[PDB]
Amino acid sequence: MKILSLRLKNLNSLKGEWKIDFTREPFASNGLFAITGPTGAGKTTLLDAICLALYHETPRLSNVSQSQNDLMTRDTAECLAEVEFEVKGEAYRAFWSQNRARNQPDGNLQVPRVELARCADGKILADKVKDKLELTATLTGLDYGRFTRSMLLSQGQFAAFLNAKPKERAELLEELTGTEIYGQISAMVFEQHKSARTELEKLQAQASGVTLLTPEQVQSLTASLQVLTDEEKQLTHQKLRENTTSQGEIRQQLKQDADNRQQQQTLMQQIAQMTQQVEDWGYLNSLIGSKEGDKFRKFAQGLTLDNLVHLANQQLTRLHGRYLLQRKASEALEVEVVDTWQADAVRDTRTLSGGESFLVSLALALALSDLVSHKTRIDSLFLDEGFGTLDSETLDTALDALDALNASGKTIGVISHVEAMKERIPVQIKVKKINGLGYSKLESTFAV
Amino acid sequence: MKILSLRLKNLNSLKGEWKIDFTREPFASNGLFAITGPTGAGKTTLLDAICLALYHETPRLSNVSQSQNDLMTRDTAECLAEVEFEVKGEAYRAFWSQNRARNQPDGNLQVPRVELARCADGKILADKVKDKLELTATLTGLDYGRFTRSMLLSQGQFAAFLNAKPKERAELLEELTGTEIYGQISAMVFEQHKSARTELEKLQAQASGVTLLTPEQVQSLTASLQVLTDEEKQLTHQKLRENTTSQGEIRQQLKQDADNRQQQQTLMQQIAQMTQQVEDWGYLNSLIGSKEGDKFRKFAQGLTLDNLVHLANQQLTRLHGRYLLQRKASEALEVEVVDTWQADAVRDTRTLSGGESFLVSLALALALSDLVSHKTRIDSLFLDEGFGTLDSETLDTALDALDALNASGKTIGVISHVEAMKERIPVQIKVKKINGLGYSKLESTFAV
Amino acid sequence: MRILHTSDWHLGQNFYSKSREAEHQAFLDWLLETAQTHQVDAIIVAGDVFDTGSPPSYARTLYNRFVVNLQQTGCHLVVLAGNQDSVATLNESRDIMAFLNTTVVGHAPQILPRRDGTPGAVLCPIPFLRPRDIQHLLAAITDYYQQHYADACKLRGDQPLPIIATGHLTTVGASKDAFPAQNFPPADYIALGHIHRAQIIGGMEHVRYCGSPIPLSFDECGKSKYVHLVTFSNGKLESVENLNVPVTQPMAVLKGDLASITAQLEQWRDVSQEPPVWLDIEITTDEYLHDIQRKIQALTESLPVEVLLVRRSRRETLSELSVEEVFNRRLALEELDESQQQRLQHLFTTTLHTLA
Amino acid sequence: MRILHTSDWHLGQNFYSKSREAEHQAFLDWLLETAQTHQVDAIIVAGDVFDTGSPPSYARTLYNRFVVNLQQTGCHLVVLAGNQDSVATLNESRDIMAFLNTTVVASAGHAPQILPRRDGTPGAVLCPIPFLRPRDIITSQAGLNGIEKQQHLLAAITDYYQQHYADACKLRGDQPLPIIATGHLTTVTLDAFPAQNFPPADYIALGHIHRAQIIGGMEHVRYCGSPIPLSFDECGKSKYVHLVTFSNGKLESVENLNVPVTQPMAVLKGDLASITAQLEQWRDVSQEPPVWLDIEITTDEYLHDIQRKIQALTESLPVEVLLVRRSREQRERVLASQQRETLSELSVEEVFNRRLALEELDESQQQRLQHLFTTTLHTLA
DNA sequence: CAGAAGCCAGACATTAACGCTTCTGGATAGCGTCCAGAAGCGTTAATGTCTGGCTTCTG
Ligand SMILES: Nc1ncnc2c1ncn2[C@@H]1O[C@H](COP(=O)(O)OP(=O)(O)O)[C@@H](O)[C@H]1O
Ligand SMILES: Nc1ncnc2c1ncn2[C@@H]1O[C@H](COP(=O)(O)OP(=O)(O)O)[C@@H](O)[C@H]1O
Ligand SMILES: [Mg+2]
Ligand SMILES: [Mg+2]
Ligand SMILES: [Mn+2]
Ligand SMILES: [Mn+2]
Ligand SMILES: [Mn+2]
């Protein structure tokens, strides 16, 4: 998943055909480098370019589309970002571009153009946005929700994984390592339970919609029949039909009351039969989940989280021996730190210091990336910020750990405003402003 | 409102009792100070005592109570935090404490005991949580919600205001200034509309719930009536009895159908009139009003967000002249950034670098603090980590602007890790980390 | 026979986050002293004793202390229910108040005894006639007063007791629907409230306005802060008298430019009087409220005065605009047309009325 | 001398949105009738007269009607302040209650007062101590500790009681008159008041405990208890009010008076069958005032739609259901699984068996649930 | 000018914001009653995405 090249145009502060490729000697020597410059020069921009080219979205912008597009540099015509990446043994190419109304500095925004293709093959694997997203997700093994917290750690949201609610935390572990059927079966179970419950409710509505004559009304009507019949036997033609007409009125009402009761009795028998089934349906729903994997998805993913924390423990011991991580006895998917020096303290991650929380998040990200090494291997990492909160006596250990990781084929590119690593890192991509003109540039070797 | 003292014991990682007074040979002037030390050595804990003893809620832990008290350091059975602050030429005193079972390192916790008192007379003005948390807010003019984003920019939450939800921002603005009558109107118009809609319903259900005979059945009953009517004239006594009996069945059916029909016509007239009533409230509820007072409050807070941004621009011009905030024409109120260098370029706040976003958030928080100045004066601000991301020249300009602000009564405290800034700052409350035991210590002039 | 007339006491009124305890207590003490000095037979109040249906605790203490002090005098006090004031909080002490020789209030006329217990006159107790209790409403109130007058006349017969009528309403010919002025029953004296501004009405002394004894607003800070004395002679009216009240909290209103008002504040240059003067500020400049308040505070902090509110006489802060104005601004985006807007504004008025 | 010992009226209390006005008025008239029958001279209530700081209007009307009705008998009344109530809400009527021969002692620092008998002779000496708020007796001091506050407050309250008892004794001098002292504090989770530190007064009236009982086995310290039940833990217990016989400056005896139960209450515990069996026993009698009932279900099965099933069971009887409770506390999770199992190679059947193994069902509904899940699984193949 | 790439105007699958309903922790308790807060599902207008007509530049 290591990135091979980058190409951007009119993105944020940067303006004009800046292409960098890691196949060259300075980046292929070791694969580890650093980026520096003034704030706002484009340090985050040249790292968000690959994120845009891969997933059509940035950590700072919810979406880019035919409307509300503002990532292009002010007063420019076309902005594009193209990257080349190698998954398994073959390299691919991802492309994104956007044009104004007529290349003028103002006007309507046009629909984006996206192309995902294999390098040196000429095969356009996808030509539409949704198809491109599906294909790139399938081939890379990384959706945006997995990439933005397993491969790239943007500033400000580095602690998001530790501070993520289980509703969004469990989905990542579900997407990784397969096993997507749990949420599906939970949603289907909830849907069928809702159907089997709403079918019973309408029977209750029919149950309470049938008018029933009261027993007092029933007896009073029956009593009138005897009165009408007895007065008849006491006999003229006028009162014959008079009693007889009232006799017919009562007979139908009793017949209708019996018919109303007859319909109710059958329906109550039916209601009783499917009531016993819906009881078990609700009981099952109470421990299998509802809608978007509300329950039992965390139950299934607890084992994956246990494996992830087991790997994170052994990686964090190598990083630094201050804390160990393990799952806490809570219903939610949570991990709590263990104080090695105290050897007994069991405290949640909410009380950690800023630097220790950053280190824990980095360790979790590294272990999570290494967990899925079996399928769609990941051999890259980027850190926008986080080293500032660390002191010099620990930042050195952090850099030593990153060097130990980079000793393998993994490539790590960090960004930091702290000058304590300007000599530790040999390669620096210097970025410079231009006389306060509102734009920025970099080394001429990468310009085109 | 400014802070005059502080005391804590076993708060987070500071065993023993410590006390710092801002009325000594150090802190004699109102000059800005700083706190430095190794990362994770209780650097924020010194800033957590003020927040805990004032509002019963640390910026990290949601609440502290008989349960889930993760704040206390391990191997301890008691903690407390006391604050002495001054407002309007008079001083008060807040307090908080908690113990364990039988003063043991294990067992359940006791209910925390609090205190609010005046330092001059010595009497106490509150002794319960539910009344003290309101009396402190009434006295100081700011509760926890206004405190945490007006005079304490905690690490990682500096840009909270900019990225806060529009409902949260509207609630903050209305709570800081103005009267909640808009909120009550919005929350009550919706209740009236709901009542009108509910009483409108259950009348249509009653109208639809009564079974009516179709006109064909009405004619069918009428046809059978005349059919049974003719042969009775053509008529025997037994035949007359059964014939007239069927006549009564039809007559009562026609009688009840007309009565049931008549009741339905009565409901239709009420519903038809009520349909004229429902538009009285539907349009009002659509234009304004909602649960918890959202739409009307958000509409009303624009007129005060205009004043807030007007103050923020004036504050920011002397702090960072590259940007002038503006109130864009958005239904959800937001601040809009105008670029001076880029010839009045307009773009969303979300697409800003970390340092410039920090500057914008700090300017907005300062303007918010100075908006309530005419009612109550706030003369304290402890900005936490996040100030060091700036470049040296930009950081120097920010420090110079803070110094210029410090000519007023504001006693700014800055917590960060910049070596140049810590050398520049005269006063340093140094913290010394222990040699692996896990605890931290202050200077020998503060311990007691 | 002598009667003291007062109305619109409005106890518990938070005058812009302030209190009225000291001035209320001083006025009550003055009222007791004047009643004792003039040997008045009875006291009448035309409703609106409390600001709202849930008055603060200190208002109850003030009212109870006033009643207790009145007990030593031995006079008679009658209390009516105001418009904003709810009858629920007044009816709570009705049983105790009657035991303490005072009446609170549909009712029947009662004989007003003198200090020696002899029947002096008769009064007509009419509280705020709520629409639920009773075009059509005008006739209802008119013939209700007619029936009450008939009952009073039946009670009188040939007795020489003068008839006194009480009510809490506004009438035509008065300035800050309306019961017509000429429709009054032929009573010796009729007392009206609900209006803080005392004024002449009807050309005859049978109907008089006592007004309010305390300043309810800066607009009513004029000298017309009187309390009326009504005297009777052998069953006929003797004369009507008005009493000047003391002030324990002066009101000051300022208008003009910033320089002019700053010059005006120099009149109170370190006078150091014991009552802090409350200031109403009206500035015609275009400067924003949030910093013009700071400018005002840059000068008022040294003077022995207190600033209550700042107003611009004519962007802007919500305190400058009213609820009706902001709602009308909200309606600018909708089509007002001809009736939709009338119905919507009427419904909004109903909602704002039923909110409190 | 006879005096009534009661407290914890809690007027205007809302009990699950149900008013207590009817039972409070019933108790008030019953107490007035008992006072008239027994020819009492002074009545003392030991605090918590009003449930909240701002009681509703009808509670105030009830209090005013009670004091007016008690004025007829001529007996004296003493009103103590609790912790729940408002000292200002009591003081707003304390000033005017003096003319009615009733005393409100909500404000602290009240001097001892002589309780007169019906004949006008001095009957006893009062020690009307309301609840002692810390803001009225102690002063805040810095350099404090977590537990030092409790000891300081205990010392202050003990000193206050000693001083007040000494003042009352020196005021009574030598006449053989009984000494009465009020109290609204708990007496022996390390927050209490030692029993032996009370002054050796003739009789101690202690409140703020809803269960009437004796403290430390000493006869002249008593808890009056609530006049009416205030929760479901005392529904089946009879409330009491104490009368005290005083003569020659010494206590003779006290007798408990049963309070009529105008609004009966009961609580149920058990499974569905037991609850239904206990509920159906009300079919015989007909309670014109509805009886309030509590349901405490202790079982493990689902009981789908409790709020409708209970309503159906109680619709045919005048039994007002107020609240329900179930043993819902339960935790669920996959175990460690030997640190080796993984979700990929694990079977959905195995995870379902593990999930159901945590539940207490064994075979009966287990087989039906397993078949149900097999049917659900079969529709995605 | 004839015709093609580009630009502008219509239906359909997500989606984010209230609102309702249920459930639960905290402030009080001699370890009990409401008050407020949080989670999860249902509605709905808003929106991005895919598909069908005009317009300027190349041959
Ligand atoms: N449309 C635009 N016009 C002008 N400047 C822009 C525009 N969009 C983004 N920018 C600028 O692009 C820069 C991006 O900086 P960024 O890479 O986020 O900095 P950092 O690496 O310090 O976080 C910011 O200075 C921002 O103001
Ligand atoms: N439950 C606990 N028991 C003991 N010590 C703790 C506990 N929770 C946190 N701590 C300590 O408190 C420290 C607080 O970190 P702090 O220095 O305030 O943060 P930062 O470095 O971001 O300013 C933690 O690093 C840890 O050493
Ligand atoms: Mg950055
Ligand atoms: Mg920190
Ligand atoms: Mn008035
Ligand atoms: Mn009135
Ligand atoms: Mn109680």
How are the elements arranged and paired?
The complex is a heterotetramer, with two copies of chain A (about 450 residues) and two copies of chain C.
Chain A: E1 3-9, E2 18-21, H1 25-28, E3 33-36, H2 45-55, E4 78-87, E5 90-99, E6 113-118, E7 124-126, H3 129-140, H4 144-147, E8 152-153, H5 166-175, H6 181-207, H7 215-233, H8 237-285, H9 297-319, E9 323-327, E10 335-339, E11 346-348, H10 354-371, E12 380-383, H11 392-406, E13 411-415, E14 428-433, E15 440-442
Parallel strand pairs in A: 3-13, 3-14, 8-12, 12-13
Antiparallel strand pairs in A: 1-2, 1-4, 4-5, 5-6, 6-7, 9-10, 10-11, 14-15
Chain C: E1 2-6, H1 21-38, E2 42-45, H2 57-73, E3 76-79, H3 87-90, H4 94-99, E4 102-104, E5 110-113, E6 119-124, H5 136-156, E7 163-167, E8 189-192, E9 207-209, E10 227-233, E11 236-243, E12 251-256, H6 258-265, E13 277-283, H7 289-300, E14 305-312, H8 323-330, H9 340-355
Parallel strand pairs in C: 1-2, 2-3, 3-4, 6-7, 7-8, 8-9, 12-13, 13-14
Antiparallel strand pairs in C: 1-10, 5-6, 10-11
The complex binds adenosine-5'-diphosphate (2 copies), magnesium ion (MG) (2 copies) and manganese (II) ion (MN) (3 copies).
Chain A binds one DNA strand of 59 nucleotides through loops.
